[PDB]
Amino acid sequence: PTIRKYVQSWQKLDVDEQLALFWFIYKEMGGSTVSPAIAEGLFNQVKELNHEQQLQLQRDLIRRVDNQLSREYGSLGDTTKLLFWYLLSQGMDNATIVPFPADYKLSSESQELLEGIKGLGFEQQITLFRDYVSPMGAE
Ligand SMILES: CC1=C(/C=C/C(C)=C/C=C/C(C)=C/C=C/C=C(C)/C=C/C=C(C)/C=C/C2=C(C)C(=O)CCC2(C)C)C(C)(C)CCC1=O
């Protein structure tokens, strides 16, 4: 559908830009099955990593790097993968994961994507995020 043009547009951004956009999408939310327990499990592991390790782990998930953790994430359902990304972002907010650069100004090319997405349907907006995270991890 149209969500394809978005996911591909999103994927055609820098790895550090993609994270930045995903992050702001999360902030704009507060101002086939899913298995939640498994998702928090992976998160717990990531929580043990230091901040650098936690950033690279996210860069790795996008770049499809072959980690021991990238493999765990790859073996998850599409719906639980998204839940896991929410746990990371929530984690950053709760000081338990690498905080976002205060000085990071978002590019205007992603400021557009942010706006276009906000105008999307709730169902679609969900499918967009779900379609974005599934093509990640290893294997
Ligand atoms: C520090 C630093 C940085 C790093 C920045 C970093 C680390 C940025 C990381 C940003 C992160 C972790 C963004 C995550 C966003 C998650 C979203 C929007 C979740 C949507 C979930 C939904 C819609 C729920 C869906 C669903 C779920 C799951 C269910 O399970 C059932 C409900 C429902 C169906 C609705 C930079 C790269 C910027 C610079 C370098 C540098 O130093």
Rounded to the nearest angstrom, the distance between the alpha carbon of 1 and the centre of ligand 1 is 23
Residue partners of 84: CB distance under 8 A and separation at least 6: 39, 42, 43, 73, 76
List the domain boundaries for the chain: 1-139
Cα(137)–Cα(22) distance, rounded to whole angstroms? 16
Rounded to the nearest angstrom, the distance between the alpha carbon of 26 and the centre of ligand 1 is 6
Q: How many angstroms separate the Cα of 50 from the Cα of each of 20, 25, 84, 98, 132?
A: 20, 25, 18, 8, 26
Experimental method: X-ray
Superfamily, domain 1-139 = Orange carotenoid-binding protein, N-terminal domain (1.10.2090.10)
One-letter amino acid at 14 equals: D
Which residue numbers come right before each break in the chain (C to N over 2.5 Å)? 31
Burial 16-26 (b: 16+ CB within 10 A, else e): ebbbbbbbbbb
Task: Quote the radius of gyration of the chain (alpha carbons, Å).
Answer: 14
| Unique residue bearing structure tokens 């993609």 | 18
Q: How many angstroms separate the Cα of 136 from the Cα of each of 17, 27, 39, 56, 78?
A: 16, 22, 15, 14, 10
Which residue has a Cα nearest atom 40 of ligand 1? 16
Burial of 84 (0-12, 13-18, 19+ CB in 10 A): buried
What resolution, expressed in A, was reported for this entry? 3.2
Task: Confirm if 97 and 46 have CB atoms less than 8 A apart.
Answer: yes
Burial 27-43 (b: 16+ CB within 10 A, else e): eeeeeeeeeeebbeebb
Cα(90)–Cα(65) distance, rounded to whole angstroms? 24
Ligand 1 atom at shortest distance from the alpha carbon of 101 = 1
